[PDB]
Amino acid sequence: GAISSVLNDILSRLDPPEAEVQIDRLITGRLQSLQTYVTQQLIRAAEIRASANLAATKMSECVLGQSKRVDFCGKGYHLMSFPQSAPHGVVFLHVTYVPAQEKNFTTAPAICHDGKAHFPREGVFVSNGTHWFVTQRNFYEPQIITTDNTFVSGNCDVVIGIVNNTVYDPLQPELDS
Amino acid sequence: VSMTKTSVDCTMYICGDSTECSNLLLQYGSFCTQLNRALTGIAVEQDKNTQEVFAQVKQIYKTPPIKDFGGFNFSQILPDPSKSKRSFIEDLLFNKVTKFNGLTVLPPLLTDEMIAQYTSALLAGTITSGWTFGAGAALQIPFAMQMAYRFNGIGVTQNVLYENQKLIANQFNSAIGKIQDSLSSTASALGKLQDVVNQNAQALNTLVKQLSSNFGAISSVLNDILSRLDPPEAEVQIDRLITGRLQSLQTYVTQQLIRAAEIRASANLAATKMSECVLGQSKRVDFCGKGYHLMSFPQSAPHGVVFLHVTY
Amino acid sequence: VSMTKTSVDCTMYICGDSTECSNLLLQYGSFCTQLNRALTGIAVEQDK
């Protein structure tokens, strides 16, 4: 809004009763340029500070420990992150567990040995078409159904959709031999 | 989650249909250039806050024809394809939510149909596949078997669900109807999204009302000052009107960035809550509401999200 | 956790005990209403 942009141009051409109007338009005009600059920088720094509360969380939990939070430190089951240096930031290397293939196997909620309902302690019951096995949800392994990996609770009259299977007891062939 | 994509242009706001106003506007520096790029940067963040929260799965899972999910009434959370594909819960969330002088209201990247397809894909992956669809491939595990590991994560033996298959169905199906009776009777539960509308309906309407203000000039209309005063004499009154509208636009983008900073902080939280509480199981107490964490059902919402948490 | 709730009113701070000041204050429109509702919204968040 002033007649010039140079501070020394108005004071050398205009009168000191007349140059004070044009100088005050330059001071108030440049003050709003700094008022817009401090406002735009502090809001963007608040997003950096909100990212600083997030980047310190990743370098304290996922880097310095094993977090059980799904999809918080990358896609998949996170194990350990390797941080790297970066200009005004950080670059992470999240080591995750991602499956590749899958196979459709016959499952069962529980089994019945002599009337009681045997529940799996860790994992679910599977079957390869002939025998009934037990494995976890993340990795398939043909483990033999024993009493140590199962839990006895209730009976087989409450659970709807149950099957029958003989529990392989290791105490039976040891006493007979 | 998101807000209204409002892009106010300083060309037609201060100098709408005027030639001499544009010569007195470019002499104030690049203030109109900076405020246009600042409001454009909000619209980039509004398109990223919808993608980083909702779009978490690279595939879309459809509804299976088998509806016997352990005897549970999941017809309320699944959208009706014969209806937009909306459900009875999403209909109560849409109908209970409470200008052309340079204000450009841009539509978002995803409409109400696109969020309903993300709702129909995430709820199909949570029920018919559990939490393995977010970490990797969707394992075809039924809903009655995935809840056995959800009790073991909080210290509950899995014999409670297998011996009370009819007791959970009489309590969980009755708790869904209590949510529908609370939203249809009053809108007090949806106050978190109505405050976003109250910070936008009172922000977009107050900016147009500043054009009727004098701002130290002899008139409010820019055409009234030019058609009455002399062109060497109207420049004193016009420059007081442009500077008065410049401080109104400076306060507007300031209020549209500080209030949106809590929305961007909530969008980083909604991307965290949907990835952790919905797409997995967490042992954090009181993170998915009051109670033990078992699962969570997200629903579509205007400029937000509604999490139907299931607690023990 | 919280902060001291201070409400700065633009009536006694801008035009405190002045009649001719209120005639020029209303020429800006609702600028004091934008400043009062901004500080009122802090007082709601301090209670939350």
Next chain:
Amino acid sequence: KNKCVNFNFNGLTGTGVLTESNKKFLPFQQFGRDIADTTDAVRDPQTLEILDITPCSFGGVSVITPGTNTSNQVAVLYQDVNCTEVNVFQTRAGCLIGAEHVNNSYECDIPIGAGICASYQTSQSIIAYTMSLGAENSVAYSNNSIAIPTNFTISVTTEILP
């Protein structure tokens, strides 16, 4: 009617587009405004009818372009207008001139808005289509058949935070 004209009232100045209306003013009132002080409908003083004041064809000039090392074809996107007041395709954000409407839904390469995206594929031209939110897949629900992975792949994802 239906043109960007400059109406000159005795106590109101401004430009706009005059068209038909469905409202009905009072017999003594002559003005009509919006909520935030925006005159959008006035009564004709000659004939007793209601005519709205529609704003003219104003909108931001946006373009859709790929990288400079690939090609030079673009697509003009006139915002907040239809394709009548100006490869013709109508979007919710405005009229898109330059892109071809393809019914095949592909991956959203360049976002536009309202579920519409554009991409430069191969012959080679910018196409307009509804964006695909993911691949078509249906989880086979079964109460006696589950899928458990036998092979794994240790992948290293890169996360960048300021």
Next chain:
Amino acid sequence: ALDPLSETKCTLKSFTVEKGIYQTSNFRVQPTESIVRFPNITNLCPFGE
């Protein structure tokens, strides 16, 4: 001011332009005819008498 492809390069002040959509300018329609909306002869002066 030749093509809308060049409007993205001069806005970002760089020739290397990636994919996306950026605002360049604003479309404006000039009014072609100004119609004065006034009522009809509502009462002539008694110049005949």
